[PDB]
Amino acid sequence: VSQETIKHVKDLIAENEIFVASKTYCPYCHAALNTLFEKLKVPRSKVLVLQLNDMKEGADIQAALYEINGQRTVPNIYINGKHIGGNDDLQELRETGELEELLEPILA
């Protein structure tokens, strides 16, 4: 994947408090998004959700994410530029108290 596509994905991560790369048919994507929006009440305005299967650039974005953080699958979640990972990683951060701390400045 090109360095310019990698830069673009880094720009999206920098431009959005929460960034999620998703696909519309993916159950773990739905779990993660529902956790953010429904359970944790994160406003939609704080989050960029890319449904890669609905984007011509989706495969390139996924390839860029692999180059950036080594992760292969969606969902792929960032919060304030920190790579969180997938749904299991999000749920772990709930249990450690780290997610509440990461979200506090976003929600305040």
UniProtKB/Swiss-Prot annotation:
According to UniProt, the reaction catalysed is: 2 glutathione + H2O2 = glutathione disulfide + 2 H2O; 1-chloro-2,4-dinitrobenzene + glutathione = 2,4-dinitrophenyl-S-glutathione + chloride + H(+); RX + glutathione = an S-substituted glutathione + a halide anion + H(+)
What induces this protein's gene, according to its Swiss-Prot or TrEMBL record? In response to heat shock and osmotic stress.
Q: What is the effect of changing residue 88 to S?
A: Leads to increased oxidoreductase activity
Instruction: Spell out the disulfide connections.
Output: 26-29
Q: Its Enzyme Commission number?
A: 1.11.1.9, 2.5.1.18
**Cellular component aspect of the GO annotation:** cytoplasm; nucleus
> Where can the Glycyl lysine isopeptide (Lys-Gly) (interchain with G-Cter in ubiquitin) cross-link be found?
10
Where can this protein be found?
Cytoplasm; Nucleus
Q: Which CDD domains match?
A: GRX_GRXh_1_2_like (cd03419)
One GO biological process this protein is involved in is:
cellular response to oxidative stress
* Entry-linked InterPro entries: GLR_AS, Glutaredoxin, Glutaredoxin_euk/vir, Glutaredoxin_subgr, Thioredoxin-like_sf
Which segments constitute the Glutaredoxin domain? 6-108
Q: What is its main location?
A: cytoplasm
In which residues is glutathione bound? 23-28, 62, 74, 87-88
In this UniProt entry, the residues modified to S-glutathionyl cysteine are 26
Pfam families assigned: Glutaredoxin (PF00462)
Keywords of the record, alphabetical order, are: Cytoplasm, Disulfide bond, Electron transport, Glutathionylation, Isopeptide bond, Nucleus, Oxidoreductase, Redox-active center, Transferase, Transport, Ubl conjugation
| GO molecular function terms attached to this record | glutathione disulfide oxidoreductase activity; glutathione peroxidase activity; glutathione transferase activity
Q: What more does the record tell us?
A: Present with 3030 molecules/cell in log phase SD medium.
The text of the family note is: Belongs to the glutaredoxin family.
Job description of the protein: Component of the glutathione system which performs several activities such as glutathione-dependent oxidoreductase, glutathione peroxidase and glutathione S-transferase (GST) activity. The disulfide bond functions as an electron carrier in the glutathione-dependent synthesis of deoxyribonucleotides by the enzyme ribonucleotide reductase. In addition, it is also involved in reducing cytosolic protein- and non-protein-disulfides in a coupled system with glutathione reductase.
Name of the protein in its database record: Glutaredoxin-1
Q: What is the species of this protein?
A: Saccharomyces cerevisiae (strain ATCC 204508 / S288c) (Baker's yeast)
